[PDB]
């Protein structure tokens, strides 16, 4: 079963800023790859899965690129409704793992 | 609409066997797989297991050795039960559906908290 390495566990950025979270899956999971965005609170939400697809809803500032083992999610300009925990997990498989997860946080 | 719903005893005293439905409805019992991720608070989440619609599981190692997944065709729930629980089980347990590679749909976990 692939492990999942996401990357960096924690993050600051100011608004407007570009922002760029990786997986990276240890054993090719096929694009099978789904990210999801929790803030403080609730349960996570599906942004992305597939890599590359935005789950319904999902406005176009985040996306999420790599194939193989490698993948990445992006926010194009960190919004503060935006400010928020994000974790990808695989599903090539059963056990469908989670990344570490990315602490977004506004740079005080 | 499409919802899931865990519901349970909040805590839980340490030894004993904490257990959770999800309430489902919106979808199907049988061509749908539930999925079940906790998080112990301030930790991240992690993949407890799932059961399909067909009652069989597939459970993350470190549990399986003491968490069982259920089913009730007959009410629209699934059940998750962990066993001699201890101070390292305490957190939000989260019920989702599985559909397509995705957990397209969450519950709002319910919390349990361990200890005598």
């Known amino acids: 079963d692939i492990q999942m390495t996401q990357s960096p566990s924690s993050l600051s950025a100011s608004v407007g800023d570009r922002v760029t979270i990786t997986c990276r899956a240890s054993?090719?999971?096929?694009?099978?790859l789904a990210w999801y965005q929790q803030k403080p609170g609730k349960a996570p939400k599906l942004l992305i899965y597939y890599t590359t697809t935005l789950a319904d809803g999902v406005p176009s500032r985040f996306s999420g690129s790599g194939s193989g083992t490698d993948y990445t999610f992006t926010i194009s300009s960190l919004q503060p409704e935006d400010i928020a925990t994000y974790y990808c997990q695989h599903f090539w498989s059963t056990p469908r793992t989670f990344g570490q997860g990315t602490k977004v946080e506004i740079k005080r | 609409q499409v919802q899931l719903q865990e519901s349970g005893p909040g805590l839980v005293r340490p030894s004993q066997t904490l257990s959770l439905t999800c309430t489902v409805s919106?979808?199907?019992?049988?061509?749908?797989?539930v999925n079940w991720v906790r998080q112990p608070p301030g930790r991240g989440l992690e993949w407890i297991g799932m059961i399909w619609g067909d009652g069989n599981t597939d459970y993350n190692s470190a549990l399986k050795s003491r968490v069982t997944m259920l089913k009730d065709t007959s009410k629209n729930q699934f059940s998750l039960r962990l066993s001699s629980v201890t101070a390292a089980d305490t957190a939000v347990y989260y019920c989702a559906r599985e559909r397509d590679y995705r957990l397209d749909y969450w519950g709002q976990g319910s919390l349990v908290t361990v200890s005598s």
């Open positions: 919106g979808f199907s019992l049988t061509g749908y797989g």
């Open positions: 054993g090719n999971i096929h694009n099978y």
